[PDB]
Design a protein around this ligand. Structure first.
Ligand SMILES: [Cl-]
Lengths: 10, 348
């Protein structure tokens, strides 16, 4: 479960 | 080209409302009282996150009151705040306009873990040290965060700057005045909270921090489980079953219960063989049953595990120099000022 919807690590 | 102007109050500043314009709004997440937006301030072009919370009509919003007082390079900055309507009809929401930080410790840890690689230790040192400074800072006001976890550790992964966020559970703890026990998130909760204690101290944040350190070294949470039963079994498997004296220090209502009888697993076997021994030593002084035996945040900053950060020649692996580590204030040093001669090296 992540804080944000988007990540450079995705 | 949609521009929105609101009347808002600077988070610090003087208490003087001003016109604030922002644009490029986009959903970046969801909170308990509506989605969380990113936007761009028209004045400076800086990115902000805008979060909604419920304004209680009887008392001042605690999270707002705490964030207005906080000024530290490892804590997310409150830029503005203002009130509006929201998701639920007839309700008034507080909007908190925070400096935007694009990543978290959790994303970086999951990125490595899913590649089956170990987070390089220099980053474990940088991240945990900045976390401990933010804790020494808020704890010096009496303020306990009560919800420390990797997803609340914002991160600029280029500069390695960490900022603690989400003060929605934070509270100034007063000895002798009880506190709800149901705060802090699955995997990170101190054992006194698992036991339902109402008389705990800021050392619950240091336990949570030790859980974050262990996760960074292990690549997975050290005490997982969907119930406090399953979590406690994992704690007992590592720490051994607590004694009656330890239980009394956590919650004396629990002293006589039957707990699983298990001998402690040696700390040097909890982690993989090549874990640096200083990291294991530090972990063993944070994940302690007896709340008062855990290091304070400022004692943790001065631990030997962080000696590489005080080396005058230390640099990030990408060739940038490390973020700011030694600009301690008197406030931040107040629990024990003469740690500053470990904390501030000669070259600073
Ligand atoms: Cl996250």
């Amino acid at each position: 479960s992540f804080r944000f919807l988007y990540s450079r690590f995705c | 080209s949609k521009v929105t102007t609101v009347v808002a109050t600077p988070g610090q500043g003087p208490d003087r409302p001003q016109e604030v314009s922002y644009t490029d709004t986009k959903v970046i997440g969801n909170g308990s009282f509506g989605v969380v937006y990113q936007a761009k301030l028209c004045d400076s072009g800086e990115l902000v996150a805008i979060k909604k919370v419920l304004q209680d009509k009887r008392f001042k919003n605690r999270e707002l009151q705490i964030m207005r007082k906080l000024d530290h390079c490892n804590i997310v900055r409150l830029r503005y705040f203002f009130y509006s309507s929201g998701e639920k009809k007839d309700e008034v929401y507080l909007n908190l306009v925070l400096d935007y930080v694009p990543e978290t410790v959790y994303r970086v840890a999951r990125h490595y873990s899913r590649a089956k690689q170990t987070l390089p230790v220099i980053y474990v040192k940088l991240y945990m040290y900045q976390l401990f400074r933010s804790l020494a800072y808020i704890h010096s006001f009496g303020i306990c965060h009560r919800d420390i976890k990797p997803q609340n550790l914002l991160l600029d992964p280029d500069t390695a700057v960490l900022k603690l966020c989400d003060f929605g559970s934070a509270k100034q703890l007063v000895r002798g005045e009880p506190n709800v026990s149901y705060i802090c998130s699955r995997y990170y909760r101190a054992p006194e909270l698992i036991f339902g204690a109402t008389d705990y101290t800021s050392s619950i944040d240091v336990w949570s921090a030790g859980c974050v350190l262990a996760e960074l070294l292990l690549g997975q949470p050290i005490f997982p489980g969907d119930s406090g039963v399953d979590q406690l079994v994992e704690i007992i498997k590592v720490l051994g079953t607590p004694t009656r004296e330890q239980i009394r220090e956590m919650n004396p209502n629990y002293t006589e219960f039957k707990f699983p009888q298990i001998k402690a697993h040696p700390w040097t076997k909890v982690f993989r063989p090549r874990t640096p021994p200083e990291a294991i030593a530090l972990c063993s002084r944070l994940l302690e049953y007896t709340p008062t035996a855990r290091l304070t945040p400022l004692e943790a900053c001065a631990h030997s595990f962080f000696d590489e950060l005080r080396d005058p020649n230390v640099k990030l692996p990408n060739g940038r120099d490390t973020p700011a580590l030694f600009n301690f204030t008197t406030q931040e040093l107040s629990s024990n000022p003469p740690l500053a001669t470990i904390l501030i090296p000669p070259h600073a």
